[PDB]
Structure formats: structure tokens, C-alpha cells
Amino acid sequence: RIHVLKNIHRESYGGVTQATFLNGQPIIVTSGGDNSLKEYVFDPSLSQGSGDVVVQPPRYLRSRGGHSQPPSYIAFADSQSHFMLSASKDRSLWSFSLRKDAQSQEMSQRLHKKQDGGRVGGSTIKSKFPEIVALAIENARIGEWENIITAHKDEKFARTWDMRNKRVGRWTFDTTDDGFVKSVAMSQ
Amino acid sequence: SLAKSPASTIQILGAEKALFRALKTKHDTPKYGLLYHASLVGQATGKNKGKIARVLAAKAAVSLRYDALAEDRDDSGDIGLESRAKVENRLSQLEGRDLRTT
Amino acid sequence: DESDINALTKILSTTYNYKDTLSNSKLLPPKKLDIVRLKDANASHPSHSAIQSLSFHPSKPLLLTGGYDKTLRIYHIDGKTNHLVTSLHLVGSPIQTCTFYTSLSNQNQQNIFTAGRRRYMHSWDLSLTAKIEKFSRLYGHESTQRSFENFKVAHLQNSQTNSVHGIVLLQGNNGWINILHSTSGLWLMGCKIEGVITDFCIDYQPISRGKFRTILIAVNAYGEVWEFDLNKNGHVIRRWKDQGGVGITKIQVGGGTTTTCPALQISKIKQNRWLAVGSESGFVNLYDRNNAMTSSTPTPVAALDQLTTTISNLQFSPDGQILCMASRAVKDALRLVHLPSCSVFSNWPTSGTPLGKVTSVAFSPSGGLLAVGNEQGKVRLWKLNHY
Amino acid sequence: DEEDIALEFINGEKKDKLVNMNSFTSMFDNIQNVQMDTFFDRVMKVLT
Amino acid sequence: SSLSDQLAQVASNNATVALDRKRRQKLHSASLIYNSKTAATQDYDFIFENASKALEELSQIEPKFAIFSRTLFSESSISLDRNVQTKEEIKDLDNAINAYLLLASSKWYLAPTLHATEWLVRRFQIHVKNTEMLLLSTLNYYQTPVFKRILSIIKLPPLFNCLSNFVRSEKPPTALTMIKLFNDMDFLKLYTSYLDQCIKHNATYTNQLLFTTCCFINVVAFNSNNDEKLNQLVPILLEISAKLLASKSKDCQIAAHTILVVFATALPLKKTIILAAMETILSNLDAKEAKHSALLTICKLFQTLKGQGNVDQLPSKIFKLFDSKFDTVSILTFLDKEDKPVCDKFITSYTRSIARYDRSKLNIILSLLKKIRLERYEVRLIITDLIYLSEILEDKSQLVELFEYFISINEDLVLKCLKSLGLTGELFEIR
Amino acid sequence: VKQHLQRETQLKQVQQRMDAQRELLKKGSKKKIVDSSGKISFKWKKQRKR
Amino acid sequence: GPYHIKYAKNGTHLLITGRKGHVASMDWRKGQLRAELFLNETCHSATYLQNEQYFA
Amino acid sequence: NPKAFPLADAALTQQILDVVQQAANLRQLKKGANEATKTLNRGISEFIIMAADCEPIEILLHLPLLCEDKNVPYVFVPSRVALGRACGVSRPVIAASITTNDASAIKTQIYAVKDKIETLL
């Protein structure tokens, strides 16, 4: 048994639904019911004499994907109707392209560093943010600082995001009255 | 008179002129002395022959004052032999390390 | 080539996991814990002082916290929402030790005994107004007991009837332990050790059907340990010496029924296997009483040295497979040492565990669940997924 | 009494030696021309 | 990619072809005996004739080199150039070189093999073409100047990357460097394939088995604190344990015993894996030192076994196989040893398998559990299945005297098991 | 002999102050303890060496 | 761009020119290049002169 | 061990190890046999504590021989492990010299313990 790629697709959406080798090629395309299509490639062997017995494990290559759950919120990122921000119940914020579907990219949730230098809390096993109730994007100062302000399900602070970097921001705005965030806005 | 001397003295015991010039001006003292010609310090190589000159002088102080101060001593080499096993596996564990990065 | 001593090759080509699965383990794996963090237990209602003592209920899902702000709080604990059951503020009486007592006869009393640096000790009778009584009479022995701080509650059998009753045990000045009734407050007996009494613990051993025997285990500061049989008159049966150990702060037993894992039914009383003597340098000797009740200079099965300042808590998990060393002197000084292997778990606590300055610790009797109270006034709560 | 049987099952467990990073580092010095059964009991002395 | 990268690829392909005099000198001065200034002036006839002398010496020591005198060391091979024939002739002579190297891996302490493989280094360029097999064959000799020499002249493969600070150095690689070399997973797959060819062609020698087992148990020791690396590592070293147990050498069998005992005490393996491991241990047990190691290995592998199911009766096939390899006198004697091994759970499983599968040899289980002491759950399960034996078959003196032993010690426990199932007056009326 | 004694006691005092400074700059937790006069001392935390 | 190829008159050296600017003189049979120069105007052709030592 | 003269009883060894612990907190002791003999040579030791627990005791019983030359008090305690705990290191300590001071906070405790030592000489 060469290798096992575990959790290559979600079991709840069907597992790996079709996997096929492109023939003559060391690349295999998988697709699952979680709205995802991946490719995995076999690199050539690392031993220069044996080869057939030292099989390097398959690594990841390109993939396309979308939301695995129906989206819960929708906004347009700019006045040109090129990108649109889209948040789903599977707790991901995607930025989908209306012009060319290769440009669709998941906004990353990799947090910044704390401003003073203290530790940030949270679980070690990183999971995605609670699913997005509302959002408000105003790209007047885009690239300059935080640009999207978003409000999640049953939590008392609103995160920010940067659409230029396509990532989370440094700030989570609290409500200061122990109430969940019911709306967000931002000025132009 | 050798047994009632500390192990640092037994380390530097041969190198008195280098020692006291390096103390009477504020310089770095020798590390070998008369104990440099032991076979274990011969087996060591680098700065760890200073290191095992130190551990060899410590175990030699142990064995030496055992020999001078024992009364039920047996002339069989037991304390010296277990001390030598301690010094040999210590020399092994600091010749096994290497300052290179692999 | 081919169509379809090879037993190992076949079992490897069929298996995909190679370790024991979930419940066919029944005893803890060493060196890697499995411990999730729950909601902080006193997060619902904050404490106004360092949390000096902490005890679970023997049966109910209740956690009693208490500290120098002279109030004691009971929390219904669960995973999500640890709420506050009730809360009693004794004015002018800061509390230092607070214990759920539950008798063996009917298991229906549910007293809380609490005490601090005072010449009295309160006893709240749990009734869900609040009827509390005050013990303030040493029946002729007030000179040798000037503060009710260090007490422990235990069970005692009459040994001519099969009638048990609770005793509280007060650590006094000279070498004295004053044992007195937990309902009437009558001074029953006293046990004097020779030196500076620093701590003590209670061991039980069964004898026959429905009869057990209570042993008080009291340690000098120097390291010599007395064991008193006290189901008879409080007479010494064994006197031994801790190997090493010069400033001795805390002794504990474990592996059977301690005062912190209490037995609900008299036939469920067990003999303790382990005995940990934790010291001022942070050294914890660990003795195995399945063989170290005979030697009279017994050697420890291991001397742990992992945390370097004064041992102020050491508690055994109810199964008796984890010991918890803890120090209130520096921050984050808590270790969970697995035993019989006598090896500290290396994956918890990490550098980011919010342990704080650990000034109390408690183990749940059923859930497999740590509560750790620090000097900021916070009980943090963890669940061990082996249980 | 299944809790008592489970407590005696976890009570009958004996202290063992665990493998460290450096429980076997000092064997290369004396794997020189010794026999393999002497190596086996030298390993078993480390494990016990 | 870039042009200098693609040209480095074509240089690495054309590494061995001498395309002018300076490359021929730099490429022919790489000797294993002489220094560069002598080695550059030597011929093929000179190095061939003294390598043929050394192969005659090596062949009268060990007579399996004569066919290498027929093909690899013949006089047609003076003019045989390596990089002028096709891939099929190349794979023919490269498995010829692999055959020579794993035959002469054992002989590396005596100078005829140095002067003989000198000709493979200089004619067939095996320091740069067949280099992985050369390193893997002489890996044992790493404190020695012959491994210093092959490291000085070698071109190091990418799997052997940590030896790159010990090439052209005056000090040998250390043991911690050897464990860092073995700690990789692809290197572990490579070395296990090398051992598979060794075990297949029957060339496993005891110095190699010692070195291999030492580095394997040090890999397991290094990875003893990360379970995912141990779990990546299990079907490699247990597969090589199966392939070492599936051979005839007592030395390689107890090498596999060492690997199995360290691996089972490093992580708790599955019960069925441990049982199939003891089946593979017993299925080829022929020696005596192998029997000593096999009994100690099966005892520790059953000791490191936790949970519900540690001390069942081991099944009928494996119990009668263990009987055919180890009878009663062997088990009783080994328990009577004053060094006191820890044989608790295995001996409990053994006596329970006797009570389910033999039903004649019960005096011996009385004697052996008189010898060694067990725990409360062990003797509780023993007396429960003895109670079931009394209720299935008629209760004679051997079962009676067993219950007299279980009355003479711990009579409260046999009362507790009878009260959990049965009665004491009813059992005394039974027997 | 009397001035040998004066030289020896002055050297003892200056080596004692030098040794206190060297002991002070090693490691561990410590606090500056001030007496009635102003003769400062450094009291080290009760913590054994790891 | 498209690469005009040129070999030396013994086959030891190769001289390639990109249409864009990339001229590389190299020993194509070892892995030794001895000139890689990017002359950012459109080159058309090249040749060796009497050697690998000069090229136009 | 028979040849470990004056050995302390429990009360004296408890107060000896108490003054060792507070001298270790005040950085006023030299722990180890070679450092003890160095303080013996330099004459800056108040008293020497040794352990009657080392398996060669002859690695110890040489500093008595230069204690009785400088009339500095010396004493034996039964446990090298407990002496190491008192000195506040992680290793067993075989001998320990409490060094001299005249502005020391624990000068009275040092003097009381050394008088209790030289009563039994």
C-alpha cells in the first residue's frame, strides 16, 4: 500500500465520488459532492537507483472549488461588477469572479498578530468562524486598511477583512453591551 | 597531600607558571596541567579535552582520596575502574555530538 | 506473476490503524494526555479573591469554591453553562478550606464544612435561609488549637457497633491533630507527632464485611511520618521516614478512597495504593503502599522533580492513575504525572494553558474532570476524555 | 461490583520503563563483533 | 525552469563521460587505493591485473567470486565501456554490480576486497553510477577508513543528504548522524528494500544485523514522542520484521525479535497484530538462541497489551503451534529462572488456553502458577474458567487440587467468584 | 606583620564585594533588600535550580 | 522568442539566440554554459568565429 | 556508616538543614566537596556539613583532616539526598560549606547552629 490521502473530500457530502488517473500521467483528478474538484500528482522517485520501491507520496496540485453549503450572504465587491463576496453556512467567505471563474478565491482566515504582543486565545484545533449573518464592504480606502466588516452568528463581535489581500483583518469590533451583532455598516 | 587537594588543583597541577601568570595579570588560565598526558585526554579532541580534563580530574580526585584515605582497601582497582567507566561513557557522549548541522 | 509465516504481512495489509481503538484500553496511555477545555466554572459569577479551596460533590454535579473574600459559592457544573446554584457570604470569616461531607449511613446529610484563620469552623447543612452551625469549642483543648485552617473530614467506625460517623481533623500547633465529631463537635481524640506538623491525610483499610479502619498519616516538617490507628484509641501503629525530603509541605494518598474521592457506600471503601510526599524544593517522592507498608525505611518508587518551587497541592485522580502536582508560588506550575509509570505527561499543560498561579486543584469523582483555581479568582475547567 | 472489578484491573498494573529519545544511543559503541543474542539481552536490559 | 537548471540536469546525465583530457583526469583520479597523482597516471591494464590478483585471493577466501571472474572481472571488461551500450545492457551490468556489492559487503575488513572493488570504481564508475548500493552495502563500516575513502570519492545521493558535511573530512560520521540518516521515511523504504535483497540472496551477516537493528531501534526511540511518525513507521519496520523472521538465519531472526520487542514497548499495537506477530515468530523457529529470544519476545509482546481482552485464551491454532515449539518443560524451566522476567499476562493467557484446549495438563499449571505470582484479575479469570471446567466435565483430583491451591491462597477471592456465579456448598457438593 | 594583616583584611573585603556582585548577576529571581542604614542586600527567591 | 540555433564547427559548443534578447553560448554536451547574456533588443542570428571564444 | 564522626540526631539535623536552606537563599553556601575544601583552604567557611550516605565515604573523610587544622566545626547528616534538597539543587550534595559573613541576616542562626555543633565537636 503506497499511501492514503485521508479526508480528501467530505464524507457527509458523499466522500470521493469520482477519482481518475489522466492516462499516461502521474496526476489523478478527484471530485466530491462537496462542490470541489482536485488534482494530485506523483513526483518522480527520490532514490536514483531503486525508484519502484521508494514511491514518493502523492502531493496536491491545482484544484477548483466553491461553497459546500448554500450561501448565506452576498455582496458585490466593487462598482465594476467583477468580484462578489459570498459567505456560506459552511463558514467560509469566498470571493467569486463574474468574469473568469479561475479568479474565484477563498478569503483566508489566518489571523494577524496581536497589537500589543500578548497571546491570542481560541482553540488550538483551528476551525472556521461562525457563519456570517451580515457584511458591509466599502472599497474607498482599499489596500490602505481593513475594508470589509462582517457579523457572525451568535457572537458578540464583528470581524474585519481586507479584500485587497483577501484575508482577515486585525480588528474585531466589540458591541460593549453583551449583545450579539445584528447589523453592520461602514461609511464611504 | 595530593588527596586533600580539590579536583581543580588536580586538573591544573602541572601548569603552575602559566596559571599564576594568568592570574597575576587578568588572563585566561590553562586547562590541562600535568593531566594532559592521560590516555583519555589523548582520546579527546578539541575543546572537549579541556572538558574531560575537568571530569578526569574530578574522578581522579575521587579515586585518589579513596586510595589515600581508605583502610579496607583491596588493591583491586574497583573504584578507579567504575570511575573510568564513568569518564569513558562521558567522553563517548561528548564525542558523539557534532557542532555541524546535518 | 501471481493470482490470489505470512500472518504478520497479512494483518498489516488489512489493518489501517495500528493501536487500541477506543474503549478496549480501560487504563491511561502514558506521555500524551487527552484533555479538552470546558467553560471556566466560576465564569458565571466571578470571585473577589484568590480561590483557596475547591471541592466537588461526591454525587451531585456541584463544585464548591471558596477564598479569602469570606464567601463560598456552589456551581452546577456541566460542559457549556456552569451556573451558580447558591452562594453564602460569611461575614468576618475568610475561608481557607471548604469540604463537601456526605455520610456513609444514609448518604443524605450533605454538609459543607468550612474554615479559615479563626477559632471556629462553620458547618452548613444543605437543604436547597440556610441552616449553618458553628463549631467553636475544643472540649478542654483550646490552647493546642488556635486556628481551624487546616482541617480534613473523614469517616470513622465505632468498632463495637457498625455505626460510622464523620470526624473533622484539625491540625494544631505542637504536633497535635485534634479529631472531633462532625455533628456534635465533641473532641474524640488527639494525636501528637514529634516535630513541626505540616500536613496529614486519611487512609482507610477494609477489614471484613462492613468494617473498615481509619488511619491518620501525619508528617513532620523534617520528613518522618506517623501512622495512627484511630478507629481504636488514637495509637501509633507505624512510624517511618521519607527518603530524602527536608522541607515537607504536603502528603497525599490515592488510588482508593481519599477525602477528595470519597466512598458513597461503606462496602465501596478501598485501600489506597499510592502515597505522595511533596516538598519545599518541588520534589515529590512517590511510595507504593502495596509493598511500602512493611519496610519502615521505604524507598520511593520515583522522586519527581519537574516543578522547582514549593509543592502546595498534590491530588490523586479517583482511579489513582494521575497525580497532580501544583505550586502556588510561580505561574503555570502544575503537572499531571501518570502512574504506575511515574512519567509526566509532556503534551499538557503547554505554554498557553491559562493555569495562572495555581492555588487550588480538584478532581471530579465521576466525570474525569479537573478544576484549577488560580490567584486571579478563576476556576478553569478541563475534561479528561479517557473517562 | 463491576466497578470493583475494573478498579482491581487497573490496580494490577506494574511500573514499566518507557522508551526515551536516548534510551538506545549508547549501543553503537558495543555492537562491534558481539553476538546478536548478546545484543538482544542488552536491549532487554534497557527495556526492563 | 531556467537554462542553468536544465544544463545542470544534462551535466548530471553526462557526469561519467570524459569529453576532454581535464575531465578524464579529474574523473580517473578518483581512486580507492592511491592518491590522485598516482591514480591519474595508472592504466586500465595495471589496475585490472592487480584487481584480478585480489579477486583470486577473495575467491579462495569465499568461493562465490568466481562467477564475477567469469563476467565482471574478465578480460573483455578491460575494453567494455559503460556508457556506450544501451539501457538493457546497463541494467544487466548494474545488477551484476549489485550482486558483487551485496556479496562483498561482509568482506570489507580485508584488503583484497578493497583492491578488487577498486576496479569497479575505476572501470565501471560505480562511485557515481551505482552509488546508492555502494553506500547501503558499506554503511556498517562508518567508523572505518574504508567508508571515509568512499565518502571522499563518492557523489552523494539525495537520500543520503546528512552525510554531506562528512565528505572530504578527517573525522568519521557519528552515531547520531547515522540515526539522523535512518530517521527518514524514504530512506527507511530504501534500506528495507536493500535488506529484502540481502535476505533473498542469503547474505545477511551478523555485523550488518547488529548495525541495522541498532539504527532501527534508535529511529523508534527518536520518534517515540510523536504517534503520527510512529504510525507512519509501523508498516515499514513490522514488514521488515516479517521478512527477517521469514528467513533461516538465527541472527536475523533475533534481530527481528529485537525490532519487534522495542516497537511493541514503544507503542501499544493491536491485539491481532501482536497475535499474528507471534504466529510469524513461531512459524520458522528452528534455532536455540532464537528460541530464547522468541520466548522473551512473546512474553514482552503480551505484557504490552492493554484493555478488555489482554488475557483471553490465545486461540487453538496459535496455542498448539506454541505447544509444538515450546513444550511444558521449557515454559516451567524458564519461569524457574532467578532473573525473574515479567511473564504475567502471557502466562495467564497460556493457562487459560490450557484449560480451554488441553484439559489433561492441569498439574503443570498448578506447578507453574505456584512458581510465579500473578495479579487479582489474572487469578480471578483463571478460577472462573476452572469453575466452568468443573461444570462442563467431571471434577477429578487435578481440578480438586487446583482448587485446594486457590483455597490455600486467596480463599476470599474464590468465594467472591463463586458468589458471583454459584455457591460454596453447591461447589463442595460438586467436588 | 600588622600591615600584612591590614592588607589581607582589605583584600578580603574587596573580594567579598566582588563575589557578591558576581553572584548577583548570574540568574534567578531576587529582590533588593534595604536595611535600617542603607546597606543593601539581595534576597533570592526560594526556588531550586532546574 | 524563437531560438536561432548554431553549433561550433566541431560540435562542442552551442549558441542559441532568442528573438527577444536571450543569447546563450554553452557546452551542450557537458552542462557548462559560458555566456548567458540578455541583450534586450531583438536579436536575429549569431555565429561563432573561430572558436567558442568569440561569437558575433 | 561507622567512620562518620559526629553524626547529628533528628532535631539538630533539622535545624542544620534549616540554616542550610536559608543560607542557600542568601547565596552563602558552597555546595560540593571540592568547593567545601576550597573554602577550607581559604579560611572563609563557618562550618562544614557532610553526608554519611556516600558509598565511598573516603571521598569525604579528608576534609575533616583539614577541618581539625583550622579548628572549623564539621558535622555529618545522614542523607545526601536531603542535603541536596536543602542546598536547593536537583542533584545529591555530598558536602556543603556555609561561608562567612558579618552583615548577614542569618548570622545569629549560623552561630547558634555552629555552637550546637561544637558542643559535640
mmCIF file of C-alpha atoms in Angstrom, chain C residues 280-281 283 305 308 330, chain F residues 45-50:
data_model
loop_
_atom_site.group_PDB
_atom_site.id
_atom_site.type_symbol
_atom_site.label_atom_id
_atom_site.label_comp_id
_atom_site.label_asym_id
_atom_site.label_seq_id
_atom_site.Cartn_x
_atom_site.Cartn_y
_atom_site.Cartn_z
ATOM 1 C CA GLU C 280 9.515 22.600 49.576
ATOM 2 C CA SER C 281 12.038 22.173 46.761
ATOM 3 C CA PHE C 283 10.499 17.226 44.926
ATOM 4 C CA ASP C 305 11.455 16.870 40.253
ATOM 5 C CA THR C 308 11.000 23.612 41.110
ATOM 6 C CA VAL C 330 5.107 30.712 40.393
ATOM 7 C CA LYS F 45 13.542 33.595 45.744
ATOM 8 C CA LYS F 46 13.051 30.186 47.315
ATOM 9 C CA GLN F 47 13.325 28.185 44.101
ATOM 10 C CA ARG F 48 15.730 25.377 43.432
ATOM 11 C CA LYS F 49 17.861 25.167 40.327
ATOM 12 C CA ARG F 50 16.318 23.247 37.426
#
